[PDB]
Structure formats: C-alpha cells, structure tokens
Amino acid sequence: MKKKPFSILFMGIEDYATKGQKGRSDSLIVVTLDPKNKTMKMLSIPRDTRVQLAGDTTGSKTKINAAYSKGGKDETVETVENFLQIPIDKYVTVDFDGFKDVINEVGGIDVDVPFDFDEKSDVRIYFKKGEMHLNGEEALAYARMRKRGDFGRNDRQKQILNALIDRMSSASNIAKIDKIAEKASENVETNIRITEGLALQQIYSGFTSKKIDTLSITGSDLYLGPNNTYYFEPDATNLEKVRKTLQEHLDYTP
C-alpha cells in the first residue's frame, strides 16, 4: 500500500436491501489518514444532515441518510464527497449482523459508558456508567440506543470506532493480526484489501485514538413543513473550515 494520504467512509446500515432499493444509512463516519506522518482525523455526519444528493441537479435537498436508499453505497459515497469536497478513497459498509460479527471476532470492545441505561436485545441488556467490555450484541444495542437528532448515537458510534482503532493499534503479533483481520472482515462490504489493512496496522502500530483530530459538523435543528420534519442544517462557515482542514490533511486542493 502506498503511503499517500487517503480517506475512508464507514457506513452503518440495517438493511442492505429493502423497498425495492436499499435501506437508509444509520451511521456515517469519515476518517482521513496521512500515513507518512502517522496522523488521522475523524468526522461523523448526522443522519439528518440536509444536503443535495449527488447527481440531483433539479431536486430539493434531503437528509443524507436517504442517499443509501436512493442509489446505494455509490450514491452515499458520492454525496459525502460532494458535501465534504474531498475524495473518498475507501469504503466500509456494515449491517447489524456484520457489525456484531466484527465485534465478536475481536473478542469484544472496551467503551466508557456515560450513564446507566438498559436496551432491548435484537436476538434486557444493562449498561452501567464507567468502563465496560461489550460483546457484539451489547455493542449493537449500545450503538442503537436513542433517548430530534442523533447526537448521542453519533458520539457512541465514534466511541466504538475509536475502540476498534485502539485495539488494532495496540496489537503486535502480525500473524495473529493477519488471521483476526481475515476473520473480522469476512462480513463487511469494503474495497480495503487484507494486505492494505495489515500495512495500515503496521504503520499505526502504537497509535492511540486520543491522537485523532476529531472535527464536527456544527449546525442547527430545523423543522420544515407543517409536519415539522426534522433536519440538521449544517453551518456554512464551519463546513468550509472542515472542508479546508480535511483537504489539507489529504494534500488535496479542490
């Protein structure tokens, strides 16, 4: 794998196929990587972010999570590219079953639970504030809990991804890493190859998620129509700064 800076879009979905098309995405996280300098940046995109869908020149803006339901992963990737004004080099898609499999193959994940709460199992699951080691079913319930936006959900999703990054960065047995990466990636849709993932693990060996520069799409709650359809309207000057920051990290000029 070349050491050129590159980006990954992580898509979390429920249904790969429904309603004659695809399902809406629930989780959208972009990571940019500068391997020559061992750096990373991370940005989640709220599911209700009001955007123009890629290729929809004559249409009205809609929620970004509808992109996957209106053209699949290709439409989501291109819509995110247009929104962030960066190329999306790699993608990872996971549905609920695939996500649980990933978590179980790495032997669970460590997260700092913010408060006590119990959720239903997709198969009661109790979470106590403080450190917890979750299996796949528990990690899915953690990611899905909702208690008018999805901000806490996005926070917990980024927590899960940070924990996965920390697990891969702290691993050492490269042959063990090879087999764990083969097993854990069997049920995700991706254009990242096993060799690329092993190279990335080697480059970021000893990295830690605290070092990731986490950016934010700031904006406002917006209720459109007499039915008060909820949208997250992105702040334009913040979005311009996020764009410039990701572009600089990627050595990409629009």
Side-chain angles (χ1 to χ4, degrees), residues 130-145 149-158:
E131 147 72 16
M132 283 191 78
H133 194 93
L134 312 176
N135 61 30
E137 159 189 45
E138 296 166 339
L140 181 63
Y142 190 74
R144 290 175 73 198
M145 186 269 283
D150 63 339
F151 187 80
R153 260 178 168 176
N154 273 240
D155 197 291
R156 285 176 257 108
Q157 290 157 16
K158 279 186 287 178

PDB file of all heavy atoms in Angstrom, residues 130-158, unseen atoms left out:
ATOM      1  N   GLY A 130     -19.330   3.968  33.340  1.00  0.00           N
ATOM      2  CA  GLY A 130     -17.955   3.565  33.541  1.00  0.00           C
ATOM      3  C   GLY A 130     -17.517   2.553  32.500  1.00  0.00           C
ATOM      4  O   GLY A 130     -18.187   2.317  31.492  1.00  0.00           O
ATOM      5  N   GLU A 131     -16.360   1.957  32.750  1.00  0.00           N
ATOM      6  CA  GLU A 131     -15.770   1.061  31.768  1.00  0.00           C
ATOM      7  C   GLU A 131     -16.614  -0.199  31.622  1.00  0.00           C
ATOM      8  O   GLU A 131     -17.087  -0.768  32.611  1.00  0.00           O
ATOM      9  CB  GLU A 131     -14.335   0.711  32.175  1.00  0.00           C
ATOM     10  CG  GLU A 131     -13.878  -0.694  31.802  1.00  0.00           C
ATOM     11  CD  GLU A 131     -13.634  -0.864  30.310  1.00  0.00           C
ATOM     12  OE1 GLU A 131     -13.530   0.161  29.597  1.00  0.00           O
ATOM     13  OE2 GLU A 131     -13.552  -2.028  29.855  1.00  0.00           O
ATOM     14  N   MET A 132     -16.820  -0.622  30.373  1.00  0.00           N
ATOM     15  CA  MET A 132     -17.474  -1.892  30.088  1.00  0.00           C
ATOM     16  C   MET A 132     -16.798  -2.550  28.897  1.00  0.00           C
ATOM     17  O   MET A 132     -16.327  -1.875  27.973  1.00  0.00           O
ATOM     18  CB  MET A 132     -18.973  -1.727  29.779  1.00  0.00           C
ATOM     19  CG  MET A 132     -19.871  -1.495  30.984  1.00  0.00           C
ATOM     20  SD  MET A 132     -21.608  -1.647  30.505  1.00  0.00           S
ATOM     21  CE  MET A 132     -21.806  -3.427  30.426  1.00  0.00           C
ATOM     22  N   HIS A 133     -16.789  -3.881  28.914  1.00  0.00           N
ATOM     23  CA  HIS A 133     -16.341  -4.693  27.789  1.00  0.00           C
ATOM     24  C   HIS A 133     -17.566  -5.357  27.169  1.00  0.00           C
ATOM     25  O   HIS A 133     -18.168  -6.244  27.778  1.00  0.00           O
ATOM     26  CB  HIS A 133     -15.319  -5.738  28.238  1.00  0.00           C
ATOM     27  CG  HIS A 133     -14.582  -6.371  27.101  1.00  0.00           C
ATOM     28  ND1 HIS A 133     -13.370  -5.899  26.646  1.00  0.00           N
ATOM     29  CD2 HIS A 133     -14.898  -7.424  26.309  1.00  0.00           C
ATOM     30  CE1 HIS A 133     -12.969  -6.639  25.625  1.00  0.00           C
ATOM     31  NE2 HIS A 133     -13.877  -7.571  25.403  1.00  0.00           N
ATOM     32  N   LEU A 134     -17.928  -4.931  25.962  1.00  0.00           N
ATOM     33  CA  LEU A 134     -19.157  -5.359  25.314  1.00  0.00           C
ATOM     34  C   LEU A 134     -18.885  -6.405  24.244  1.00  0.00           C
ATOM     35  O   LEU A 134     -17.909  -6.305  23.499  1.00  0.00           O
ATOM     36  CB  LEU A 134     -19.867  -4.165  24.673  1.00  0.00           C
ATOM     37  CG  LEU A 134     -20.022  -2.928  25.555  1.00  0.00           C
ATOM     38  CD1 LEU A 134     -20.659  -1.818  24.736  1.00  0.00           C
ATOM     39  CD2 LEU A 134     -20.860  -3.234  26.783  1.00  0.00           C
ATOM     40  N   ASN A 135     -19.766  -7.398  24.162  1.00  0.00           N
ATOM     41  CA  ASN A 135     -19.762  -8.326  23.037  1.00  0.00           C
ATOM     42  C   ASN A 135     -20.551  -7.694  21.883  1.00  0.00           C
ATOM     43  O   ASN A 135     -21.009  -6.552  21.968  1.00  0.00           O
ATOM     44  CB  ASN A 135     -20.303  -9.690  23.465  1.00  0.00           C
ATOM     45  CG  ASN A 135     -21.746  -9.642  23.956  1.00  0.00           C
ATOM     46  OD1 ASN A 135     -22.539  -8.805  23.527  1.00  0.00           O
ATOM     47  ND2 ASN A 135     -22.093 -10.561  24.847  1.00  0.00           N
ATOM     48  N   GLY A 136     -20.726  -8.438  20.790  1.00  0.00           N
ATOM     49  CA  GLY A 136     -21.347  -7.859  19.605  1.00  0.00           C
ATOM     50  C   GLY A 136     -22.787  -7.427  19.823  1.00  0.00           C
ATOM     51  O   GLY A 136     -23.182  -6.332  19.410  1.00  0.00           O
ATOM     52  N   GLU A 137     -23.592  -8.277  20.458  1.00  0.00           N
ATOM     53  CA  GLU A 137     -24.979  -7.919  20.748  1.00  0.00           C
ATOM     54  C   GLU A 137     -25.054  -6.679  21.637  1.00  0.00           C
ATOM     55  O   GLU A 137     -25.837  -5.749  21.385  1.00  0.00           O
ATOM     56  CB  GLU A 137     -25.680  -9.114  21.396  1.00  0.00           C
ATOM     57  CG  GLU A 137     -26.921  -8.796  22.195  1.00  0.00           C
ATOM     58  CD  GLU A 137     -27.413 -10.000  22.974  1.00  0.00           C
ATOM     59  OE1 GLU A 137     -26.578 -10.684  23.602  1.00  0.00           O
ATOM     60  OE2 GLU A 137     -28.630 -10.273  22.955  1.00  0.00           O
ATOM     61  N   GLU A 138     -24.216  -6.635  22.674  1.00  0.00           N
ATOM     62  CA  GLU A 138     -24.207  -5.477  23.559  1.00  0.00           C
ATOM     63  C   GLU A 138     -23.711  -4.229  22.838  1.00  0.00           C
ATOM     64  O   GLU A 138     -24.245  -3.133  23.048  1.00  0.00           O
ATOM     65  CB  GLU A 138     -23.342  -5.779  24.789  1.00  0.00           C
ATOM     66  CG  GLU A 138     -23.905  -6.907  25.650  1.00  0.00           C
ATOM     67  CD  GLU A 138     -22.905  -7.439  26.658  1.00  0.00           C
ATOM     68  OE1 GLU A 138     -21.686  -7.246  26.460  1.00  0.00           O
ATOM     69  OE2 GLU A 138     -23.348  -8.050  27.648  1.00  0.00           O
ATOM     70  N   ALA A 139     -22.693  -4.372  21.987  1.00  0.00           N
ATOM     71  CA  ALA A 139     -22.151  -3.212  21.289  1.00  0.00           C
ATOM     72  C   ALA A 139     -23.159  -2.653  20.294  1.00  0.00           C
ATOM     73  O   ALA A 139     -23.258  -1.429  20.125  1.00  0.00           O
ATOM     74  CB  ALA A 139     -20.842  -3.580  20.588  1.00  0.00           C
ATOM     75  N   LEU A 140     -23.932  -3.534  19.650  1.00  0.00           N
ATOM     76  CA  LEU A 140     -25.002  -3.082  18.761  1.00  0.00           C
ATOM     77  C   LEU A 140     -26.066  -2.319  19.534  1.00  0.00           C
ATOM     78  O   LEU A 140     -26.495  -1.234  19.113  1.00  0.00           O
ATOM     79  CB  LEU A 140     -25.625  -4.274  18.034  1.00  0.00           C
ATOM     80  CG  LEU A 140     -26.743  -3.902  17.050  1.00  0.00           C
ATOM     81  CD1 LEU A 140     -26.163  -3.029  15.953  1.00  0.00           C
ATOM     82  CD2 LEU A 140     -27.431  -5.132  16.464  1.00  0.00           C
ATOM     83  N   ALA A 141     -26.517  -2.876  20.666  1.00  0.00           N
ATOM     84  CA  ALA A 141     -27.518  -2.176  21.467  1.00  0.00           C
ATOM     85  C   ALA A 141     -26.990  -0.830  21.951  1.00  0.00           C
ATOM     86  O   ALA A 141     -27.734   0.157  22.004  1.00  0.00           O
ATOM     87  CB  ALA A 141     -27.959  -3.039  22.652  1.00  0.00           C
ATOM     88  N   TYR A 142     -25.706  -0.781  22.316  1.00  0.00           N
ATOM     89  CA  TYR A 142     -25.068   0.471  22.706  1.00  0.00           C
ATOM     90  C   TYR A 142     -25.117   1.491  21.574  1.00  0.00           C
ATOM     91  O   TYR A 142     -25.424   2.669  21.800  1.00  0.00           O
ATOM     92  CB  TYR A 142     -23.620   0.183  23.119  1.00  0.00           C
ATOM     93  CG  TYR A 142     -22.886   1.335  23.765  1.00  0.00           C
ATOM     94  CD1 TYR A 142     -23.167   1.715  25.068  1.00  0.00           C
ATOM     95  CD2 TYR A 142     -21.899   2.032  23.070  1.00  0.00           C
ATOM     96  CE1 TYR A 142     -22.486   2.757  25.670  1.00  0.00           C
ATOM     97  CE2 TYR A 142     -21.212   3.083  23.662  1.00  0.00           C
ATOM     98  CZ  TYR A 142     -21.512   3.437  24.962  1.00  0.00           C
ATOM     99  OH  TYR A 142     -20.849   4.473  25.570  1.00  0.00           O
ATOM    100  N   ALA A 143     -24.822   1.048  20.346  1.00  0.00           N
ATOM    101  CA  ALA A 143     -24.809   1.954  19.200  1.00  0.00           C
ATOM    102  C   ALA A 143     -26.204   2.426  18.832  1.00  0.00           C
ATOM    103  O   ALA A 143     -26.358   3.537  18.314  1.00  0.00           O
ATOM    104  CB  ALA A 143     -24.171   1.274  17.989  1.00  0.00           C
ATOM    105  N   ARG A 144     -27.225   1.608  19.097  1.00  0.00           N
ATOM    106  CA  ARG A 144     -28.578   1.903  18.630  1.00  0.00           C
ATOM    107  C   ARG A 144     -29.406   2.718  19.614  1.00  0.00           C
ATOM    108  O   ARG A 144     -30.424   3.293  19.205  1.00  0.00           O
ATOM    109  CB  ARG A 144     -29.326   0.603  18.319  1.00  0.00           C
ATOM    110  CG  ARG A 144     -28.818  -0.130  17.092  1.00  0.00           C
ATOM    111  CD  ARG A 144     -29.521  -1.469  16.921  1.00  0.00           C
ATOM    112  NE  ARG A 144     -30.906  -1.320  16.470  1.00  0.00           N
ATOM    113  CZ  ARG A 144     -31.828  -2.270  16.579  1.00  0.00           C
ATOM    114  NH1 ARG A 144     -31.518  -3.438  17.133  1.00  0.00           N
ATOM    115  NH2 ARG A 144     -33.061  -2.050  16.142  1.00  0.00           N
ATOM    116  N   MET A 145     -29.008   2.784  20.884  1.00  0.00           N
ATOM    117  CA  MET A 145     -29.841   3.424  21.895  1.00  0.00           C
ATOM    118  C   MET A 145     -30.140   4.872  21.524  1.00  0.00           C
ATOM    119  O   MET A 145     -29.264   5.600  21.049  1.00  0.00           O
ATOM    120  CB  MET A 145     -29.162   3.367  23.262  1.00  0.00           C
ATOM    121  CG  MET A 145     -30.033   3.883  24.398  1.00  0.00           C
ATOM    122  SD  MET A 145     -29.826   5.647  24.712  1.00  0.00           S
ATOM    123  CE  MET A 145     -28.266   5.639  25.597  1.00  0.00           C
ATOM    124  N   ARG A 146     -31.391   5.280  21.745  1.00  0.00           N
ATOM    125  CA  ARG A 146     -31.855   6.629  21.435  1.00  0.00           C
ATOM    126  C   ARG A 146     -32.767   7.100  22.558  1.00  0.00           C
ATOM    127  O   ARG A 146     -33.770   6.445  22.858  1.00  0.00           O
ATOM    128  CB  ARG A 146     -32.596   6.669  20.094  1.00  0.00           C
ATOM    129  N   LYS A 147     -32.420   8.228  23.172  1.00  0.00           N
ATOM    130  CA  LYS A 147     -33.220   8.793  24.254  1.00  0.00           C
ATOM    131  C   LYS A 147     -32.913  10.274  24.452  1.00  0.00           C
ATOM    132  O   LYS A 147     -32.537  10.698  25.545  1.00  0.00           O
ATOM    133  CB  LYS A 147     -32.977   8.032  25.560  1.00  0.00           C
ATOM    134  N   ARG A 148     -35.502  14.022  16.842  1.00  0.00           N
ATOM    135  CA  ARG A 148     -34.886  15.228  17.382  1.00  0.00           C
ATOM    136  C   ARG A 148     -33.359  15.128  17.366  1.00  0.00           C
ATOM    137  O   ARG A 148     -32.688  15.568  18.299  1.00  0.00           O
ATOM    138  CB  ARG A 148     -35.383  15.488  18.805  1.00  0.00           C
ATOM    139  N   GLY A 149     -32.815  14.545  16.305  1.00  0.00           N
ATOM    140  CA  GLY A 149     -31.383  14.421  16.144  1.00  0.00           C
ATOM    141  C   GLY A 149     -30.858  13.082  16.630  1.00  0.00           C
ATOM    142  O   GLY A 149     -31.563  12.277  17.244  1.00  0.00           O
ATOM    143  N   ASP A 150     -29.578  12.852  16.348  1.00  0.00           N
ATOM    144  CA  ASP A 150     -28.920  11.595  16.688  1.00  0.00           C
ATOM    145  C   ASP A 150     -27.546  11.849  17.306  1.00  0.00           C
ATOM    146  O   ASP A 150     -26.594  11.101  17.067  1.00  0.00           O
ATOM    147  CB  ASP A 150     -28.805  10.697  15.451  1.00  0.00           C
ATOM    148  CG  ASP A 150     -27.943  11.315  14.351  1.00  0.00           C
ATOM    149  OD1 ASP A 150     -27.765  12.551  14.355  1.00  0.00           O
ATOM    150  OD2 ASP A 150     -27.438  10.566  13.485  1.00  0.00           O
ATOM    151  N   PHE A 151     -27.422  12.896  18.130  1.00  0.00           N
ATOM    152  CA  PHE A 151     -26.091  13.324  18.556  1.00  0.00           C
ATOM    153  C   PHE A 151     -25.441  12.310  19.491  1.00  0.00           C
ATOM    154  O   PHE A 151     -24.274  11.949  19.305  1.00  0.00           O
ATOM    155  CB  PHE A 151     -26.146  14.695  19.224  1.00  0.00           C
ATOM    156  CG  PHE A 151     -24.786  15.256  19.538  1.00  0.00           C
ATOM    157  CD1 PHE A 151     -24.026  15.859  18.550  1.00  0.00           C
ATOM    158  CD2 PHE A 151     -24.257  15.157  20.818  1.00  0.00           C
ATOM    159  CE1 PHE A 151     -22.771  16.370  18.833  1.00  0.00           C
ATOM    160  CE2 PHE A 151     -23.001  15.667  21.108  1.00  0.00           C
ATOM    161  CZ  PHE A 151     -22.258  16.273  20.114  1.00  0.00           C
ATOM    162  N   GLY A 152     -26.173  11.853  20.510  1.00  0.00           N
ATOM    163  CA  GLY A 152     -25.618  10.855  21.414  1.00  0.00           C
ATOM    164  C   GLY A 152     -25.289   9.551  20.711  1.00  0.00           C
ATOM    165  O   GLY A 152     -24.278   8.907  21.010  1.00  0.00           O
ATOM    166  N   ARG A 153     -26.143   9.147  19.766  1.00  0.00           N
ATOM    167  CA  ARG A 153     -25.856   7.988  18.927  1.00  0.00           C
ATOM    168  C   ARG A 153     -24.539   8.160  18.182  1.00  0.00           C
ATOM    169  O   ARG A 153     -23.711   7.248  18.153  1.00  0.00           O
ATOM    170  CB  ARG A 153     -26.996   7.769  17.930  1.00  0.00           C
ATOM    171  CG  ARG A 153     -27.993   6.698  18.312  1.00  0.00           C
ATOM    172  CD  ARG A 153     -29.103   6.620  17.269  1.00  0.00           C
ATOM    173  NE  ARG A 153     -29.938   5.432  17.423  1.00  0.00           N
ATOM    174  CZ  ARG A 153     -31.019   5.179  16.692  1.00  0.00           C
ATOM    175  NH1 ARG A 153     -31.401   6.035  15.753  1.00  0.00           N
ATOM    176  NH2 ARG A 153     -31.721   4.071  16.899  1.00  0.00           N
ATOM    177  N   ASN A 154     -24.337   9.326  17.559  1.00  0.00           N
ATOM    178  CA  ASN A 154     -23.093   9.567  16.831  1.00  0.00           C
ATOM    179  C   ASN A 154     -21.896   9.530  17.770  1.00  0.00           C
ATOM    180  O   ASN A 154     -20.820   9.037  17.403  1.00  0.00           O
ATOM    181  CB  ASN A 154     -23.158  10.912  16.108  1.00  0.00           C
ATOM    182  CG  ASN A 154     -23.794  10.802  14.741  1.00  0.00           C
ATOM    183  OD1 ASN A 154     -23.173  11.112  13.726  1.00  0.00           O
ATOM    184  ND2 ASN A 154     -25.038  10.345  14.706  1.00  0.00           N
ATOM    185  N   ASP A 155     -22.070  10.043  18.990  1.00  0.00           N
ATOM    186  CA  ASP A 155     -20.986  10.005  19.963  1.00  0.00           C
ATOM    187  C   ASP A 155     -20.597   8.568  20.281  1.00  0.00           C
ATOM    188  O   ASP A 155     -19.414   8.213  20.257  1.00  0.00           O
ATOM    189  CB  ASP A 155     -21.391  10.748  21.233  1.00  0.00           C
ATOM    190  CG  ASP A 155     -20.205  11.105  22.096  1.00  0.00           C
ATOM    191  OD1 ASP A 155     -19.583  10.186  22.667  1.00  0.00           O
ATOM    192  OD2 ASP A 155     -19.891  12.308  22.201  1.00  0.00           O
ATOM    193  N   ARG A 156     -21.590   7.722  20.567  1.00  0.00           N
ATOM    194  CA  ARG A 156     -21.301   6.324  20.880  1.00  0.00           C
ATOM    195  C   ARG A 156     -20.732   5.567  19.681  1.00  0.00           C
ATOM    196  O   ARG A 156     -19.877   4.688  19.852  1.00  0.00           O
ATOM    197  CB  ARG A 156     -22.559   5.636  21.414  1.00  0.00           C
ATOM    198  CG  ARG A 156     -22.894   6.032  22.847  1.00  0.00           C
ATOM    199  CD  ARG A 156     -24.192   5.406  23.327  1.00  0.00           C
ATOM    200  NE  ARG A 156     -25.292   6.367  23.322  1.00  0.00           N
ATOM    201  CZ  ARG A 156     -26.300   6.352  22.452  1.00  0.00           C
ATOM    202  NH1 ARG A 156     -26.358   5.419  21.508  1.00  0.00           N
ATOM    203  NH2 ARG A 156     -27.256   7.269  22.530  1.00  0.00           N
ATOM    204  N   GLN A 157     -21.186   5.889  18.466  1.00  0.00           N
ATOM    205  CA  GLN A 157     -20.603   5.277  17.276  1.00  0.00           C
ATOM    206  C   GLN A 157     -19.125   5.633  17.142  1.00  0.00           C
ATOM    207  O   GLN A 157     -18.288   4.768  16.846  1.00  0.00           O
ATOM    208  CB  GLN A 157     -21.382   5.710  16.027  1.00  0.00           C
ATOM    209  CG  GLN A 157     -22.777   5.110  15.942  1.00  0.00           C
ATOM    210  CD  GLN A 157     -23.719   5.919  15.061  1.00  0.00           C
ATOM    211  OE1 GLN A 157     -23.292   6.770  14.279  1.00  0.00           O
ATOM    212  NE2 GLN A 157     -25.011   5.666  15.203  1.00  0.00           N
ATOM    213  N   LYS A 158     -18.781   6.907  17.346  1.00  0.00           N
ATOM    214  CA  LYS A 158     -17.374   7.276  17.269  1.00  0.00           C
ATOM    215  C   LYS A 158     -16.583   6.604  18.380  1.00  0.00           C
ATOM    216  O   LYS A 158     -15.430   6.215  18.177  1.00  0.00           O
ATOM    217  CB  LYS A 158     -17.218   8.793  17.314  1.00  0.00           C
ATOM    218  CG  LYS A 158     -17.467   9.450  15.952  1.00  0.00           C
ATOM    219  CD  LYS A 158     -17.166  10.941  15.982  1.00  0.00           C
ATOM    220  CE  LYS A 158     -18.239  11.699  16.755  1.00  0.00           C
ATOM    221  NZ  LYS A 158     -17.943  13.162  16.855  1.00  0.00           N
TER     222      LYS A 158
END
